[PDB]
Amino acid sequence: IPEYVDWRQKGAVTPVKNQGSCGSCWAFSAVVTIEGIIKIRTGNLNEYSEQELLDCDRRSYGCNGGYPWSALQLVAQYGIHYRNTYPYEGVQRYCRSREKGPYAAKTDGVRQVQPYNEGALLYSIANQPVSVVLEAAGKDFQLYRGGIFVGPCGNKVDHAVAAVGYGPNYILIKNSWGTGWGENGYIRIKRGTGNSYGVCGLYTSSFYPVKN
Ligand SMILES: *[C@@H](C(=O)O)[C@H](O)C(=O)N[C@@H](CC(C)C)C(=O)NCCC(C)C
Numbered sequence: 001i002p003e004y005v006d007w008r009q010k011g012a013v014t015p016v017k018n019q020g021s022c023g024s025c026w027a028f029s030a031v032v033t034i035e036g037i038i039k040i041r042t043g044n045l046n047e048y049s050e051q052e053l054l055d056c057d058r059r060s061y062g063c064n065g066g067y068p069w070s071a072l073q074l075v076a077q078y079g080i081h082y083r084n085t086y087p088y089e090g091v092q093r094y095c096r097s098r099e100k101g102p103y104a105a106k107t108d109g110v111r112q113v114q115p116y117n118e119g120a121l122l123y124s125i126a127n128q129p130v131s132v133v134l135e136a137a138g139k140d141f142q143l144y145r146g147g148i149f150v151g152p153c154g155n156k157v158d159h160a161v162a163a164v165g166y167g168p169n170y171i172l173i174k175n176s177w178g179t180g181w182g183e184n185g186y187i188r189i190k191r192g193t194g195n196s197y198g199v200c201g202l203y204t205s206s207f208y209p210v211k212n
Contacts, residue, residue: 001126006165006172012039012129013164014047016185018178020090022063025160027053028176029131030071030209032162034080036129037211038105048105049086055095062092068131068160069207072110076209079103113206116196121206122166129164131207132173133157134189134200141200146183150190155201163206166191171202 007013014035019028027050039045053060053071056078060066074080081097082104097103113130114120124130135141136159140152148170165172170188179185189199197203 001123004165004167005122005126007036007129008164010039011045012036013174014045016174016179017050017088017176019050019088019176022054022090022092023061023065024050024054024063024090025176026060026066026068027051027057027071029133029160029162030068030075031080031083032164032174033072033129033131033207033209034075034105034107036162036164037107037209040128041211046104047083049081049083049088051088051093052081052086052095052097055093056097063090068133068205069110069112072107072131072207072209075105076107076109079106107209107211109210110207111210113208115205116198116203118191118198118203121163121171121198121203122191124206124208125163125166125171128208129162129174131160132163132202133160133205134173134198134202135159136200138200141187144182144187148188148190150193150199153200155197155204157201157204161187 059070162174173187
């Protein structure tokens with residue numbers, strides 16, 4: 001795999017979003033990976049619906065948190081609408097998929113990256129954007145405004161984001177806290193520290209969609 005990957009340069013990443021106060025990070029993370037894999041497979045970059053996952057995933061807890069895995073499983077079982085068709089409201093409502101016409105995209109499955117393994121995560125990122133989790137509760141992560149981040153942070157993961165690239169000493173992460181946080185909404189988290197958890201627990205739980 002190469003030294004640098006950046007799916008933004010391949011036109012596979014949509015603009016940075018703001019989840020607001022709702023604990024919907026799991027849905028934002030899943031949607032980044034869907035937008036990526038649909039571009040890779042079909043050539044078209046579209047925005048897909050975080051709100052639909054928020055409303056419709058009965059394995060997750062709405063604005064009180066959820067699971068990237070079950071969000072990706074839902075898209076593989078049913079499909080997902082365009083963001084425009086089912087836009088983000090920041091509050092859980094009833095599932096409105098059937099009112100809003102046919103789904104716009106569908107995937108075929110979900111796979112996990114081997115956990116606690118930096119090289120396995122880089123390998124998956126070289127193929128597509130990957131849903132990853134990290135510990136975001138610490139003030140250092142909250143206040144991050146640029147540079148290669150090394151913490152302080154622990155491994156008490158609590159926040160789902162999306163890995164859309166990497167370089168020699170970092171992994172490139174799209175966050176859902178608006179463009180005013182980090183590097184235009186992104187963070188470069190240091191890699192290669194020898195900590196099997198990853199910096200801020202970044203290697204704990206990583207998933208990506210499968211689309212034949
Ligand atoms: C993340 C956010 O900042 O919106 C959101 O709070 C969330 O979904 N957190 C989950 C943990 C991450 C590791 C994805 C979460 O709390 N999920 C609840 C399910 C388990 C019982 C922890």
